[PDB]
Amino acid sequence: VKMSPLPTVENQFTPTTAWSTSVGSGIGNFYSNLHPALADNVVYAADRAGLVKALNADDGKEIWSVSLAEWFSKEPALLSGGVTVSGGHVYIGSEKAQVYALNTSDGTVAWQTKVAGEALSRPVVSDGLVLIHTSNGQLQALNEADGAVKWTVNLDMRGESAPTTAFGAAVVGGDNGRVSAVLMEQGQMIWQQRISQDVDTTPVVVNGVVFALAYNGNLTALDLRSGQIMWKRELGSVNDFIVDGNRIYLVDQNDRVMALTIDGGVTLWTQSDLLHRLLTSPVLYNGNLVVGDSEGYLHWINVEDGRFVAQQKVDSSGFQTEPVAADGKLLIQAKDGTVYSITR
């Protein structure tokens, strides 16, 4: 295996960097799911060692910052899952099995809770609860007001695995190959389905259908209500996907990018010119598919035919965690921690 060359692309437009701002030492060479959040024109971002910053979304200037690092005088917090913002709190999970809630106003700690295992996936907030899927197979619901554990479900037992929420239920994937639905009220189990016999096992729930990758990279669609399997695509080896309209866009383990029909394809097209370049998850921005690579380039892809429409060099430390498209903005954090706002 060898990395594909940088594609030659005739830019249809010239994307640029609007601003960039350092955030500590980022994630370095460690695997992480840590990425930025955006709410009310403020970007919230963190680094593994424990630094968290709030930045003005128009110019990237710091509003507040806080270090969460606490036999030695100081030790890294190992921030990992997040950042998630909701209702005046910033939520971040750590590999030390802590979940932090910070005030959006000033970065002060609202609460901190010891959870049942490493919190490597983004906190997901719904109905007054912060849902935490721990790396050792538990789903825990914390009160957003005080961080107390309201309920805990054993699922139960490398790639992100956040819960998904839908109409009063949480849906969780992850090892070992089962998808589960539980009721938010008290964590009552509704159903489980086996979809098995790196990978983002976070389910995506769209219009009553659960789309989920198995740890082996097979893509499956399940009925939200019953967990019945509607279709499975033994590609396999998908790493990340998104759903939009009647299409699924995905990046496979070899960094091929494809578009599938929402009925499980039909592969509409495959773009293989980024093979082995080590891509981020894809996002949609201004109608184009965007992915970053390990060399620090962003690649802009036409969703109709998979052709490149633009390419830009952003950060020599490279990309790994997900680009974020929200509120008309495109944000991405480099491995060395630098957060970028990108303009089309």
From Swiss-Prot:
Subcellular location: Cell outer membrane
Family designation: Belongs to the BamB family.
Domain of life: Bacteria
Annotated source species: Escherichia coli (strain K12)
GO molecular function: identical protein binding
Keyword hit for Membrane: yes
PANTHER family, per the entry: CELL SURFACE PROTEIN (PTHR34512), OUTER MEMBRANE PROTEIN ASSEMBLY FACTOR BAMB (PTHR34512:SF30)
Membrane topology field: Lipid-anchor
InterPro entries, per the entry: BamB (IPR017687), PQQ_b-propeller_rpt (IPR018391), PQQ_rpt_dom (IPR002372), Quinoprotein_ADH-like_sf (IPR011047), WD40/YVTN_repeat-like_dom_sf (IPR015943)
Name assigned to this protein: Outer membrane protein assembly factor BamB
